[PDB]
Homo-oligomer: A and B are copies of this chain.
Amino acid sequence: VEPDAGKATWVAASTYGTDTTTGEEVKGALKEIHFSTYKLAAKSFITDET
């Protein structure tokens, strides 16, 4: 599962040259979410007399 924002830092416009800041954001970070399974079980019996 992905993450969102993502904050781009505005630049006052004194300079030219590129000369571009970018808020130093992680290019590819993701989150694993993992699932697990439980088991319900029962037993019954029948005696050889009833």
Q: Which residues of A contact B (CB under 8 A)?
A: 16-18, 45, 47, 49
5 contacts between A and B (CB under 8 A): A16-B47, A16-B49, A17-B45, A17-B47, A18-B47
Give the interface SS of chain A, mostly helix, strand, loop or mixed.
loop
Which chain B residues border A17 with CB–CB below 8 Å? 45, 47
Q: Which 5 A-B pairs have the closest CB atoms?
A: A17-B47, A16-B49, A16-B47, A17-B45, A18-B47
With both beta carbons as reference points, the residue of chain B lying nearest to A17 in the complex is identified as B47
Expressed in whole angstroms, the Cα–Cα distance for A34 and B18 within the complex equals 43
Within the assembled complex, what's the spacing in Å between the Cα atoms of A36 and B48? 53
Point out the residues of chain B lying under 8 angstroms from A16, CB to CB: 47, 49
